[PDB]
């Protein structure tokens, strides 16, 4: 079945809870694989330790740049980059798990949880998955974000994995 997946969040070191992601491997299973081992850190690399570094209220809340913990940067378990696997799953509303971009095929490892419906993103955001548990977790990430994304507090991604 389809994976399952865990961010543990900290905010300033104290820790808000668990976020648990179901990844749609059903439908992206190229984009839920690179989710999922980047999760378990199995490739020598990944979430744990990173930062949600952009958060914008009434948005979504965005992370996984690991190698430069500002937005310009992550990579995947394929490479720097990988293809839009397909647009089928739609930004339906709050808990959509979403891969960042910076235009057309250039997904890496940075994706965005989504606090209100983003319809402007279907087409052109892979999305492929969404919170099961933890969104109160997620509400409290977009409390300390901005209109610009900076956080007003520091959010790590403290430990991370796969439950099934
Ligand atoms: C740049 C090189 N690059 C990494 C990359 C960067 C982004 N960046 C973003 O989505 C982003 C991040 N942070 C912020 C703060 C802000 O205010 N806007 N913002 C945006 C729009 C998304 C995906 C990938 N992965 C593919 C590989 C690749 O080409």
New binding site residues.
Partial sequence: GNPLVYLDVDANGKPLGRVVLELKADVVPKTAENFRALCTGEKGFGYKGSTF??VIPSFMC?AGDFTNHN????KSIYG??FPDENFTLKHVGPGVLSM???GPN???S?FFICTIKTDWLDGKHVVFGHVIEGMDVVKKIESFGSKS?RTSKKIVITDCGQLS
């Fill in positions: 570094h952009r965005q937005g310009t940067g992550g720097s980059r960042a971009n910076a250039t997904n890496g940075q994304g």
